[PDB]
Amino acid sequence: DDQYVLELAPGQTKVVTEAEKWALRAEGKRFFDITERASSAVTYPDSVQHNETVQNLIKSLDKKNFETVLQPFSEFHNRYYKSDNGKKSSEWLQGKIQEIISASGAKGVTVEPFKHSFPQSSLIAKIPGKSDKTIVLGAHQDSINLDSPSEGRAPGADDDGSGVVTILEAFRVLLTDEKVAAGEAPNTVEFHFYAGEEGGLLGSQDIFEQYSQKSRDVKAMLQQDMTGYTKGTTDAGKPESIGIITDNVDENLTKFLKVIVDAYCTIPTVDSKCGYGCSDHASATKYGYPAAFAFESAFGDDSPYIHSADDTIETVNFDHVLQHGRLTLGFAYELAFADSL
Ligand SMILES: *[C@@H]1O[C@H](CO)[C@@H](O[C@@H]2O[C@H](CO)[C@@H](O[C@@H]3O[C@H](CO[C@H]4O[C@H](CO[C@H]5O[C@H](CO)[C@@H](O)[C@H](O)[C@@H]5O)[C@@H](O)[C@H](O[C@H]5O[C@H](CO)[C@@H](O)[C@H](O)[C@@H]5O)[C@@H]4O)[C@@H](O)[C@H](O[C@H]4O[C@H](CO)[C@@H](O)[C@H](O)[C@@H]4O[C@H]4O[C@H](CO)[C@@H](O)[C@H](O)[C@@H]4O)[C@@H]3O)[C@H](O)[C@H]2NC(C)=O)[C@H](O)[C@H]1NC(C)=O
Ligand SMILES: [Cl-]
Ligand SMILES: [Zn+2]
Ligand SMILES: [Zn+2]
């Protein structure tokens, strides 16, 4: 005591100290932290159906908005989920989401905190549709410095500030569609900003456990974690691409994600695996929901600065973030209007 229980592979657990937990992370191992829960097909459209509408919404994306939000978000000393910094950064992000909702005038759209047993709350923004079939867009809002998690500097600009501002800007543009804002889409859309991802997927485990216990009908979940770093790709002489993960994800949903990238982005896809417990999509998968995951690059070309003080906004390519904004908008809109899910 304190003893943390980690799940490193299906049905395989290890009891560790907190220091050993961060040492595992530093070696590249991921896991679910299951300390508090110690014993714990959908067919998609074959092609895009709303190309004219989505192409017009894409013209409203503004890459200056990514940097306007990411700069002050990264100025929190860290956004560590067990720190008062992480409570304050979540409250700040909640205020930014609320400013977008209030300025849209969309009567039924809300954001609410999801409480956890640590100071940093997750955030869920909801766009009600005509049915409770739900499409989820996710990113994690916490950051960590693995050499000193509680008090170490962690700007978290790429990991995962980039994903946060990607889906926040897609959320803003979605609310400019009159039918979506009025609640007339056949399906409900939610934007999730997960707390405590760096501690072992703590916030997304809580959310999808509760959704499963309440029989929430999640028809698709897309996670984005690190959407901004292209220098590794360009240094290697490789084509700028959207990375698509192929393990711990739903195969049909991943095929649909590639349809979305082919239709709405101007760069190609590149497949990789990233292992067990890799990001918050793994929590959706664990609790039985179909999930997919996109990120910045091919395997091994991602930011080498993550989990340190050097994960700064100067490493982020906002033209690449814009490509992820386009795919987020297309994924959300096409599935919001997929009445056969
Ligand atoms: C959703 O909706 C959106 C709309 O919002 C849809 O957008 C459409 O998307 C498609 C696909 O992405 C686009 O098609 C592609 O468009 C470009 C057109 O680019 C213009 O420039 C060309 C180059 O011109 C320069 O160079 C010439 C050299 O001769 C100069 O003379 C010029 O001055 C320029 O400097 C130009 O050639 C094009 O002209 C053609 O189109 C006009 C407009 O209709 C005609 O007047 C012309 O006569 C001529 O037909 C154009 O003005 C093209 O480059 C793409 O063509 C390639 O791909 C075709 C399909 O594969 C293929 O048949 C062509 O031969 C061509 O192939 C060439 O390129 C390949 C690589 O790309 C090579 O491998 C190959 O060897 C060959 O060299 C293609 O036409 C639409 O433009 C775009 N439309 C709009 C309105 O935005 C979107 O499709 C929708 N999505 C869905 C439904 O999923
Ligand atoms: Cl990471
Ligand atoms: Zn991350
Ligand atoms: Zn991380």
Side-chain angles (χ1 to χ4, degrees), residues 2-63 65-131 133-177 180-254 256-341:
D2 308 304
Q3 299 177 297
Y4 297 77
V5 184
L6 312 182
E7 196 182 13
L8 322 188
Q12 290 171 210
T13 60
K14 186 187 217 349
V15 181
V16 300
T17 66
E18 207 172 31
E20 291 164 347
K21 178 171 161 174
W22 306 131
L24 288 168
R25 288 296 313 287
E27 301 171 359
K29 314 283 224 311
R30 262 91 165 107
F31 44 77
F32 295 90
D33 177 337
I34 61 170
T35 304
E36 311 181 321
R37 46 169 62 80
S39 319
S40 303
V42 187
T43 65
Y44 300 95
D46 294 322
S47 61
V48 298
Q49 293 289 335
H50 301 276
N51 184 62
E52 175 186 8
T53 297
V54 175
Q55 292 290 342
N56 183 77
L57 293 174
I58 277 171
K59 292 179 170 58
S60 295
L61 293 166
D62 185 348
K63 73 175 169 169
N65 290 346
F66 300 133
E67 195 171 349
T68 297
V69 176
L70 189 50
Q71 176 64 51
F73 197 49
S74 74
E75 286 169 15
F76 287 98
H77 183 67
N78 58 47
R79 307 186 298 274
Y80 180 55
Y81 74 103
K82 282 166 74 165
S83 169
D84 191 62
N85 289 329
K87 180 173 181 290
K88 295 208 145 40
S89 63
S90 176
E91 292 169 348
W92 180 93
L93 181 56
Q94 186 181 347
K96 291 290 171 272
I97 299 165
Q98 185 63 58
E99 288 167 2
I100 291 169
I101 296 170
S102 293
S104 76
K107 170 181 165 64
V109 177
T110 59
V111 60
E112 53 191 289
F114 189 105
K115 192 81 183 71
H116 304 293
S117 63
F118 40 82
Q120 182 181 71
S121 297
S122 294
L123 297 164
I124 298 175
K126 301 175 182 189
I127 305 176
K130 289 142 108 141
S131 82
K133 303 175 179 181
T134 302
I135 312 305
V136 175
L137 291 304
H140 70 91
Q141 56 162 298
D142 61 318
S143 72
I144 196 171
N145 183 323
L146 283 174
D147 280 31
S148 198
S150 177
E151 300 176 338
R153 176 78 173 112
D158 198 37
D159 181 19
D160 189 19
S162 61
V164 167
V165 302
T166 294
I167 72 175
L168 182 69
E169 172 69 359
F171 176 71
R172 179 191 69 84
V173 169
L174 251 195
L175 297 181
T176 74
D177 184 281
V180 173
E184 294 179 347
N187 306 320
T188 293
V189 183
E190 294 185 359
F191 286 74
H192 292 188
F193 303 82
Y194 299 112
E197 188 269 357
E198 296 286 10
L201 313 182
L202 290 165
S204 58
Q205 281 181 81
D206 270 1
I207 285 172
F208 289 109
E209 177 180 54
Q210 187 206 257
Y211 275 29
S212 167
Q213 290 173 339
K214 298 217 259 181
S215 301
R216 291 290 309 273
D217 189 14
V218 175
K219 292 297 195 180
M221 187 274 187
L222 171 67
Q223 172 73 359
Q224 284 173 101
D225 192 349
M226 296 173 51
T227 64
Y229 182 79
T230 60
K231 193 168 183 292
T233 299
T234 53
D235 285 346
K238 293 160 86 169
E240 184 182 337
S241 305
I242 303 288
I244 308 287
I245 285 298
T246 65
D247 56 340
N248 304 120
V249 295
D250 181 81
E251 154 170 7
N252 288 347
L253 186 57
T254 297
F256 175 81
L257 175 61
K258 293 188 182 181
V259 169
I260 291 292
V261 173
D262 296 353
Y264 294 129
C265 302
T266 61
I267 54 172
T269 61
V270 58
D271 288 3
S272 62
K273 316 215 295 196
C274 66
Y276 192 78
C278 169
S279 192
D280 298 296
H281 65 290
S283 310
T285 293
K286 178 174 195 182
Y287 285 98
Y289 294 120
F293 177 97
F295 73 111
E296 62 202 7
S297 71
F299 180 81
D301 295 332
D302 52 313
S303 177
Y305 308 113
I306 67 180
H307 309 142
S308 81
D310 300 316
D311 185 11
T312 67
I313 191 165
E314 282 70 35
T315 72
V316 171
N317 173 357
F318 287 104
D319 294 315
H320 191 85
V321 176
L322 183 56
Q323 285 304 317
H324 279 86
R326 292 171 62 124
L327 86 78
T328 305
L329 186 55
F331 184 97
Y333 197 96
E334 293 285 341
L335 291 180
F337 284 89
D339 56 322
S340 61
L341 298 183

